[PDB]
Amino acid sequence: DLRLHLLLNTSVTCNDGSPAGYYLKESRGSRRWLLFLEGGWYCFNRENCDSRYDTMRRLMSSRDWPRTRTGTGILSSQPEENPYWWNANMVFIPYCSSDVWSGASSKSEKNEYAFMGALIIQEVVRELLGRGLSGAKVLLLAGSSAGGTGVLLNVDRVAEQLEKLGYPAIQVRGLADSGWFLDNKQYRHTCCAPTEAIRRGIRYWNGVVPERCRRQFQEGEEWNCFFGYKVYPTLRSPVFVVQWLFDEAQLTVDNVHLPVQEGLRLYIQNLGRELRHTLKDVPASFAPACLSHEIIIRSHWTDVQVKGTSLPRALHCWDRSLHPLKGCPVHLVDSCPWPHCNPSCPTG
Numbered sequence: 001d002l003r004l005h006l007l008l009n010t011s012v013t014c015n016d017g018s019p020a021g022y023y024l025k026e027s028r029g030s031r032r033w034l035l036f037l038e039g040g041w042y043c044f045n046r047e048n049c050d051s052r053y054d055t056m057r058r059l060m061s062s063r064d065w066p067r068t069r070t071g072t073g074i075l076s077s078q079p080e081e082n083p084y085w086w087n088a089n090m091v092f093i094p095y096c097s098s099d100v101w102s103g104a105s106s107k108s109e110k111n112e113y114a115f116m117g118a119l120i121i122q123e124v125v126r127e128l129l130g131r132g133l134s135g136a137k138v139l140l141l142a143g144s145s146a147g148g149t150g151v152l153l154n155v156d157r158v159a160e161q162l163e164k165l166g167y168p169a170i171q172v173r174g175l176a177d178s179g180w181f182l183d184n185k186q187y188r189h190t191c192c193a194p195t196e197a198i199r200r201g202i203r204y205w206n207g208v209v210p211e212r213c214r215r216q217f218q219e220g221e222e223w224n225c226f227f228g229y230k231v232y233p234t235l236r237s238p239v240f241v242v243q244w245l246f247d248e249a250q251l252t253v254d255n256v257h258l259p260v261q262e263g264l265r266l267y268i269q270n271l272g273r274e275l276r277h278t279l280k281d282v283p284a285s286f287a288p289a290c291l292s293h294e295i296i297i298r299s300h301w302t303d304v305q306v307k308g309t310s311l312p313r314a315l316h317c318w319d320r321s322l323h324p325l326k327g328c329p330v331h332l333v334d335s336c337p338w339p340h341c342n343p344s345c346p347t348g
């Protein structure tokens with residue numbers, strides 16, 4: 001029910017130079033817009049991007065994209081599946097730039113691949129203004145995994161872009177799902193250490209980060225802005241953070257692969273404690289004590305609860321807060337210390 005549109009500006013491309021695009025389901029009565037950034041890791045040199053092109057080509061190219069996609073979770077148009085924003089205009093932006101949505105570089109005689117993630121978002125926003133976004137009251141930029149980090153890197157640029165295009169009434173907000181990572185010590189050492197790979201990626205991609213964060217960390221240190229707890233305080237747009245306390249991707253880059261003995265037990269408990277600590281001053285957040293990865297486009301996303309409140313409810317309470325609320329909380333972080341100490345955790 002979401003229909004493919006390739007970008008009219010065909011200079012804004014996926015990795016291999018094919019045009020980027022978006023899937024759109026309009027809702028005629030609605031002034032709410034949901035733009036969702038797909039995730040799927042990244043690549044950061046010629047050799048690992050070549051490998052990704054062999055076996056993950058849909059993440060690098062639009063050549064084989066289907067004409068439609070079915071919206072699931074927060075992208076579902078059915079109230080039964082999506083209590084939050086079922087009647088919104090929905091946009092799914094495929095991740096085909098392998099750059100955590102940060103890149104601003106074209107394929108050229110010096111570049112085998114194009115890394116245009118940041119420009120893809122800008123161009124989607126620009127072309128949507130002629131399809132009804134000009135009349136929007138709220139634009140929620142959402143995303144899972146690398147797309148969740150992409151929200152953090154791009155939400156304020158979308159707000160700046162709309163302001164400079166003459167649309168200061170559109171309220172831009174962010175929803176970052178499973179994109180809030182820690183640059184912590186690995187349980188065992190190896191690469192991968194995400195700090196080093198992101199450092200190399202930014203140079204390979206011509207990656208860009210939000211301006212205030214860039215000005216804090218300065219040249220050569222912009223990799224810091226890919227880490228939510230560092231970039232979030234620099235952002236002006238309201239951002240709701242969704243993060244499993246024991247995220248599978250975090251554990252993977254930490255070289256944890258699950259009878260747990262004391263060293264690993266303490267490692268996992270300390271990871272949950274550190275994640276919880278970084279969310280202490282994030283007023284809008286949903287952080288269940290589960291070992292999982294992504295939530296908001298999963299069909300059963302309504303099932304998990306923190307302190308008896310589901311994520312669709314928390315997001316609705318967030319909406320109300322942006323118009324504390326009795327019985328409508330927006331800060332929901334588990335305090336129990338082990339995966340699945342919350343009984344509503346996904347089953348697998």
Ligand SMILES: *[C@@H]1O[C@H](CO)[C@@H](O)[C@H](O)[C@H]1NC(C)=O
Binds near residue numbers: 009011012123
């Ligand atoms: C196409 O996109 C590029 C890169 O974002 C930009 O420089 C150029 O002005 C755009 N052209 C049109 C016609 O939108």
